[PDB]
Amino acid sequence: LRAEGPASVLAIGTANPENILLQDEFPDYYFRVTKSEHMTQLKEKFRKICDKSMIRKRNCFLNEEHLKQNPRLVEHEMQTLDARQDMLVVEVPKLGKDACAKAIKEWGQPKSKITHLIFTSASTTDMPGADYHCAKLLGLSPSVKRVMMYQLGCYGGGTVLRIAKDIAENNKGARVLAVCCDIMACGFRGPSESDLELLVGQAIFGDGAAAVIVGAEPDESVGERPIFELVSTGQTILPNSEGTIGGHIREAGLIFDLHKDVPMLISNNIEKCLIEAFTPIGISDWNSIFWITHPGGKAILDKVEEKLHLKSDKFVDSRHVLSEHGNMSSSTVLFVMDELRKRSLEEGKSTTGDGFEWGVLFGFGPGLTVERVVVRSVPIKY
Amino acid sequence: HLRAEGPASVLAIGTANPENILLQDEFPDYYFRVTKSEHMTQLKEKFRKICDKSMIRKRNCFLNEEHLKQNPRLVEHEMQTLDARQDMLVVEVPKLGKDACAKAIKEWGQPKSKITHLIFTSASTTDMPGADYHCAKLLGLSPSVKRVMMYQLGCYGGGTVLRIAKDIAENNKGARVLAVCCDIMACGFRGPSESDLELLVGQAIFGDGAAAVIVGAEPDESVGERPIFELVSTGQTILPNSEGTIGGHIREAGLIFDLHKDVPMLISNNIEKCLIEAFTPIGISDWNSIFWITHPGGKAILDKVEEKLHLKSDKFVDSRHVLSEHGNMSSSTVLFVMDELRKRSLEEGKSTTGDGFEWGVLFGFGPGLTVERVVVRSVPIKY
Numbered sequence: 001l002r003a004e005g006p007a008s009v010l011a012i013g014t015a016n017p018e019n020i021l022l023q024d025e026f027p028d029y030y031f032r033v034t035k036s037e038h039m040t041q042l043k044e045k046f047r048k049i050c051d052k053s054m055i056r057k058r059n060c061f062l063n064e065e066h067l068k069q070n071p072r073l074v075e076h077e078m079q080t081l082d083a084r085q086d087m088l089v090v091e092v093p094k095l096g097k098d099a100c101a102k103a104i105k106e107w108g109q110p111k112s113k114i115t116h117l118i119f120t121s122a123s124t125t126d127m128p129g130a131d132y133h134c135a136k137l138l139g140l141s142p143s144v145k146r147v148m149m150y151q152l153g154c155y156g157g158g159t160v161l162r163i164a165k166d167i168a169e170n171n172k173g174a175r176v177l178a179v180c181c182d183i184m185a186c187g188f189r190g191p192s193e194s195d196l197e198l199l200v201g202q203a204i205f206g207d208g209a210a211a212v213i214v215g216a217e218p219d220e221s222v223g224e225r226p227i228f229e230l231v232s233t234g235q236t237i238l239p240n241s242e243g244t245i246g247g248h249i250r251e252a253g254l255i256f257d258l259h260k261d262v263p264m265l266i267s268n269n270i271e272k273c274l275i276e277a278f279t280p281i282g283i284s285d286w287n288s289i290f291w292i293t294h295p296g297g298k299a300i301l302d303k304v305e306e307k308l309h310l311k312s313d314k315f316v317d318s319r320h321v322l323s324e325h326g327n328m329s330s331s332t333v334l335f336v337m338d339e340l341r342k343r344s345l346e347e348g349k350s351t352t353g354d355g356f357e358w359g360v361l362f363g364f365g366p367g368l369t370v371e372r373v374v375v376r377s378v379p380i381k382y
Numbered sequence: 383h384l385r386a387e388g389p390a391s392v393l394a395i396g397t398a399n400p401e402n403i404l405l406q407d408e409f410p411d412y413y414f415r416v417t418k419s420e421h422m423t424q425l426k427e428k429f430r431k432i433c434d435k436s437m438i439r440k441r442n443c444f445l446n447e448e449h450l451k452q453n454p455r456l457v458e459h460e461m462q463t464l465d466a467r468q469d470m471l472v473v474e475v476p477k478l479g480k481d482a483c484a485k486a487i488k489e490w491g492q493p494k495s496k497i498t499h500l501i502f503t504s505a506s507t508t509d510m511p512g513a514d515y516h517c518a519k520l521l522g523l524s525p526s527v528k529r530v531m532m533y534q535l536g537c538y539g540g541g542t543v544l545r546i547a548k549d550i551a552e553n554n555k556g557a558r559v560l561a562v563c564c565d566i567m568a569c570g571f572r573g574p575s576e577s578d579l580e581l582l583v584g585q586a587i588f589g590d591g592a593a594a595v596i597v598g599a600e601p602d603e604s605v606g607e608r609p610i611f612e613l614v615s616t617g618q619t620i621l622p623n624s625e626g627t628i629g630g631h632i633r634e635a636g637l638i639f640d641l642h643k644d645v646p647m648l649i650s651n652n653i654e655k656c657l658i659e660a661f662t663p664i665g666i667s668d669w670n671s672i673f674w675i676t677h678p679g680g681k682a683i684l685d686k687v688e689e690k691l692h693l694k695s696d697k698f699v700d701s702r703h704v705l706s707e708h709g710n711m712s713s714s715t716v717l718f719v720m721d722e723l724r725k726r727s728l729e730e731g732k733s734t735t736g737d738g739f740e741w742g743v744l745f746g747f748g749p750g751l752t753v754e755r756v757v758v759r760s761v762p763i764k765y
């Protein structure tokens with residue numbers, strides 16, 4: 001028995017740790033707790049990176065008491081993976097379960113109707129995985145079909161939507177719980193004079209989890225209503241991008257590579273993704289649609305906006321999420337989805353997509369891989 | 383959105399294994415020599431009986447004695463060696479994977495440009511970009527191939543990649559899914575210790591290998607496509623009272639795994655209820671009237687399941703043969719079993735790809751304790 005019509009997002013939930021990192025105070029915090037305050041010139045460059053990041057605040061699970069309890073974590077490169085794993089194999093499923101619960105609350109259906117669980121995280125790795133623990137913490141059926149996807153990266157938010165679409169539409173009644181979660185205790189480390197690449201990540205990455213319920217044939221009879229339709233999906237590797245975005249599980253924890261070319265590579269290639277995605281729909285004005293864009297960095301948004309001459313209203317939700325949360329990897333793009341529909345409602349727009357009918361969702365991550373989802377809005381009943 | 387009509391079918395199967403071979407009869411001595419542990423005479427005899435009862439004749443292993451020479455940290459029990467293992471496996475895991483995909487693509491006989499999705503699972507490593515990215519580049523797939531990277535599933539992953547491919551191939555007309563599993567046990571090789579019988583078991587049963595399948599719906603005989611097994615339904619479940627019995631952990635010392643002795647009994651004591659749920663809609667109750675494609679996680683698992691259900695000697699022939707010639711290769715093993723089942727059936731002139739039976743069941747078992755189940759239907763072999 002296959003489902004009729006397209007899969008849609010029926011609910012969204014998000015969660016963040018309680019502890020907060022004010023970006024104005026982070027240079028002082030970072031260089032103090034890492035006992036690197038003598039690197040004045042480096043701290044000066046780090047301060048400019050933080051000030052230019054357009055991040056006002058992040059939530060982070062790792063706090064100063066964790067650092068005093070294990071000073072090894074504040075060093076630059078030091079065998080710490082066990083200590084990080086010990087924390088994250090617990091916290092990642094926990095924070096993920098927090099976001100799942102809020103999404104199920106909105107959804108308003110028995111957890112026994114959840115037939116599938118998709119879980120993605122780049123912050124940890126274990127067997128059984130975070131899908132198992134999150135399922136147990138939620139009290140889901142022991143026969144929930146799980147799709148565990150460790151170490152995707154920041155494109156992963158588009159991935160779980162792609163996976164959920166085919167599952168929901170091919171299985172009548174299937175209701176897919178897809179959650180992303182990342183905790184940057186996996187890659188926190190101290191500064192080195194030879195790494196501005198490190199400092200960039202230390203300034204932009206924050207903690208969070210985002211969960212959605214995906215399903216076809218929404219049942220208004222019992223309180224289900226979709227927010228966004230998932231119309232088509234794609235995934236591609238950008239040319240001349242090899243090595244530009246990388247992340248590795250090592251004895252020192254998560255070690256990442258981040259090339260300065262990434263913003264230009266995305267901007268110079270993204271229009272082909274739009275043509276490839278919207279030519280069948282007959283759309284060519286990239287301002288006549290709504291955008292749900294992963295804010296991988298201020299620069300990425302700025303350059304895409306520049307190359308395509310996008311009105312400033314398109315990345316408003318991306319920038320607001322980046323300001324209040326930083327880059328949370330795979331979850332970030334679903335935070336933006338949620339903000340888009342909450343702002344549309346609060347501003348009296350006619351649809352959940354800022355008043356537009358058609359939209360596009362993008363994730364960017366290692367590859368350099370681009371995840372794309374053409375999405376359709378729903379009218380807002382007033 | 384144009385969806386496919388009819389069920390998704392395995393259209394091709396290819397496998398690969400490292401070249402260096404470990405003979406089980408010599409492995410107790412070889413293992414305790416290279417690990418500088420010949421003074422553990424009572425633990426070695428203990429280890430010799432585990433290997434004697436394992437019903438494993440040989441295994442394929444990428445890690446050789448020269449590797450242990452270059453890095454002696456790999457032969458100690460619990461030394462920080464992850465970086466050295468990863469340096470090897472981020473390269474070798476996709477490579478061996480590509481070798482198996484290449485054979486599957488060969489049998490399939492269709493252009494690589496027709497591959498629309500690539501599924502890759504492996505428990506031996508993790509990286510970003512992952513083995514899926516590199517396996518696709520090694521193969522020459524389209525940069526727009528849709529990848530599904532599933533790191534650290536474990537021994538049930540062979541059923542998972544089938545369950546994932548089923549929904550993709552059926553919801554997308556023309557979709558051709560390349561699913562591959564691959565594991566290399568340099569991720570978990572380590573020296574012995576009198577306080578870890580689980581390790582000894584793992585060092586005796588785990589071997590290297592990769593296996594890849596081409597999965598699609600609406601097979602096109604005009605272009606040379608021939609189905610092998612139809613994927614009918616799928617299930618995943620967590621066995622009750624099974625917490626912590628199968629585990630694997632990426633640590634500074636590499637992959638550390640747990641294996642509780644009760645795993646055979648827990649599987650055998652729960653498996654029939656998996657059969658009932660899977661075959662009651664089809665109207666089948668006799669577990670000897672169907673063929674089996676069973677992950678040979680260990681000789682004890684097959685033995686106990688065989689007893690509990692009174693399965694006849696034909697069911698586990700292919701599982702035990704793969705186990706004897708390759709050991710436990712984790713996620714790929716069950717796919718090695720599928721391949722031999724359809725190959726032996728034609729060599730023996732059986733009515734179908736499933737040993738003459740129409741309906742069958744595929745099982746993977748792993749961390750959870752997780753059981754992956756796939757009801758499968760064979761395709762007639764016409765003579």
Ligand SMILES: CCCCCCCCCCCCC(=O)SCCNC(=O)CCNC(=O)[C@H](O)C(C)(C)COP(=O)(O)OP(=O)(O)OC[C@H]1O[C@@H](n2cnc3c(N)ncnc32)[C@H](O)[C@@H]1OP(=O)(O)O
Binds near residue numbers: 053185201202258
């Ligand atoms: C905490 C643990 C983390 C754990 C992670 C969890 C898992 C995730 C795995 C995957 C990880 C891989 C990634 O991480 S994927 C993130 C994608 N996001 C981007 O790719 C950001 C886009 N970029 C921007 O948003 C702006 O660049 C930014 C940073 C706001 C700055 O704002 P600004 O406008 O001022 O730009 P400037 O050029 O002026 O830079 C000012 C100075 O920083 C230097 N600089 C910048 N960029 C650099 C780079 N790339 N390399 C080396 N130097 C770099 C410049 O050279 C200059 O230095 P100088 O010339 O000496 O003065």
